[PDB]
Design a protein around this ligand. Sequence first.
Ligand SMILES: *[C@@H]1O[C@H](CO)[C@@H](O)[C@H](O)[C@H]1NC(C)=O
Ligand SMILES: [Ca+2]
Ligand SMILES: [Ca+2]
Ligand SMILES: [Ca+2]
Length: 428
Amino acid sequence: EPNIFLIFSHGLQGCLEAQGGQVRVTPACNTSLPAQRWKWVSRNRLFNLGTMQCLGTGWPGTNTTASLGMYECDREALNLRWHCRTLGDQLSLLLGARTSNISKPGTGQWRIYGSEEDLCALPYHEVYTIQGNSHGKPCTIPFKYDNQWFHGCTSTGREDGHLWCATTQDYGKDERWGFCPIKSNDCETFWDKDQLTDSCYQFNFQSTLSWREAWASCEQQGADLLSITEIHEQTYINGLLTGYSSTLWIGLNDLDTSGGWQWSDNSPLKYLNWESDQPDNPSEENCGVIRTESSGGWQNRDCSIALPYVCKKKPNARLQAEKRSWQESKKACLRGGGDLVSIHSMAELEFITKQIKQEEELWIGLNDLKLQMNFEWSDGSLVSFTHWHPFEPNNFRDSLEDCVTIWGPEGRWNDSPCNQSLPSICKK
Ligand SMILES: *[C@@H]1O[C@H](CO)[C@@H](O)[C@H](O)[C@H]1NC(C)=O
Ligand SMILES: [Ca+2]
Ligand SMILES: [Ca+2]
Ligand SMILES: [Ca+2]
């Protein structure tokens, strides 16, 4: 089982254990004894596998030094809260010393046993539930189910093998639960597969999660937040979304470089379904959504609001200085046997940055002339890479800017009116 560890004291040469109603260091360390096996769980609690309880100290009426004890993990009136960085020091401190220990005949770092990592090595990570009745809320670890404590996900209580967790600490009381995410290359359960491609989709209509939690939820399933890379993809999504009413997080965000738009996965931004007046509120709303209200259009929203979200996975997978309009800046490339330049890589971008361009604006082969905000190279190559300018493409004011420039020093692009007279670059 992952994330279970023994706690080894170098000073006292032994492992922490819980047994017989005591907490103590035993010189015989055994990785297979439940009394010696610990796990970090939620709310900074340290769970013992053999006792099924959490390490703590009390609040007695006698206001005096504390000692270690084991407690039912739902008793949060007590001090059940530790911190992995200071835990070793506090174990030593609270273990104390008997007079026998400091008066012997003849006149201490703690670590995971084995690997010898620090006690922060195996932190607890929240696990967002899938479907269930909990709207995606993380597992409550540990939880009680049929009078037993579980320190992780379990198939107990189900016949179908699917691992699940409670989303409170007592399922019998509350009956709130969800499935645990699984990493797999199959799309059969909790997924839908586009059969025309390798893509699998999960529309979690009933979940309410922040964009970051939704990102993590898709990550824990071996997937990523939806990226819409192609008119084909937006078409499938629109078909699937017909008849629903929902607003869902997708992988689009400007978070890193303000205004720089990107998929959370690495897909190029060659396709934009922004709604009419969106993006608005640039410093405010940093994360994209898709909405049925707009027949599949995209808005940006404050990333902390709780929304449903879509997960996706694909398991089976020289210059011309003469100023002219973009249009037949291409004609000048075609005659001469070439085409306006396409860029498939950041190196090919830098290949062209200082070398060919040599200090300002100029045309490349990227254009949306055929379908608005679906960008293609004029030389017909795959659009596998894009370097845009924050807020671009735009269509400044409401006006068609159907052709792309290199405006700026470092090679980032912009969509501008195709009749602006500018230099160009060709390739063959
Ligand atoms: C750990 O306990 C098992 C009994 O379950 C025993 O067979 C084994 O030898 C023990 N390991 C050590 C190092 O004492
Ligand atoms: Ca908005
Ligand atoms: Ca355009
Ligand atoms: Ca523009």
